[PDB]
Amino acid sequence: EMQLTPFLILLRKTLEQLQEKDTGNIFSEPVPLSEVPDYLDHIKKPMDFFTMKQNLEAYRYLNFDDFEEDFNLIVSNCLKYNAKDTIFYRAAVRLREQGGAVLRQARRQAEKMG
């Protein structure tokens, strides 16, 4: 029923909006494992906005929940790995806060499609 192209257009816009909230671009690329050698010790599934864009374009997000789940991993991995008193941890809290409103608006648009 629901068409694929307008859904992917929405996800592209939503991803851009989420990225815009990450003003430091600290989530724009994968955590460099060369520089954080213990990262995979703690984090089961790394995620970042570039990997999300690739997934998007590989038609790997066919419902809103799967897209939102990867965004949430960006946040949750960061909260997990970094101490509370760091800029990184607080950036993840802020992203959670500001990304929430973005996601809620985008999900309503997706619901209007079905």
From Swiss-Prot:
Residues 2-106 form the Bromo domain. It comes from the Eukaryota. It is found in: Nucleus; Chromosome; Cytoplasm. High levels in testis. Acetylated by KAT6A. It is linked to Intellectual developmental disorder with dysmorphic facies and ptosis: An autosomal dominant neurodevelopmental disorder characterized by delayed psychomotor development, intellectual disability, delayed language, and facial dysmorphisms, most notably ptosis. Additional features may include poor growth, hypotonia, and seizures. Component of some HBO1 complex composed of KAT7/HBO1, MEAF6, ING5, and BRPF1. Component of the MOZ/MORF complex composed at least of ING5, KAT6A, KAT6B, MEAF6 and one of BRPF1, BRD1/BRPF2 and BRPF3. Interacts (via PHD-type zinc finger domains) with unmethylated histone H3 at 'Lys-4' (H3K4me0). Interacts with trimethylated 'Lys-36' of histone H3 (H3K36me3). Interacts with ING5; interaction directs BRPF1 to H4K4me3-enriched chromatin at the 5' of active genes. Interacts with KAT7. Scaffold subunit of various histone acetyltransferase (HAT) complexes, such as the MOZ/MORF and HBO1 complexes, which have a histone H3 acetyltransferase activity. Plays a key role in HBO1 complex by directing KAT7/HBO1 specificity towards histone H3 'Lys-14' acetylation (H3K14ac). Some HAT complexes preferentially mediate histone H3 'Lys-23' (H3K23ac) acetylation. Positively regulates the transcription of RUNX1 and RUNX2. This is Peregrin.
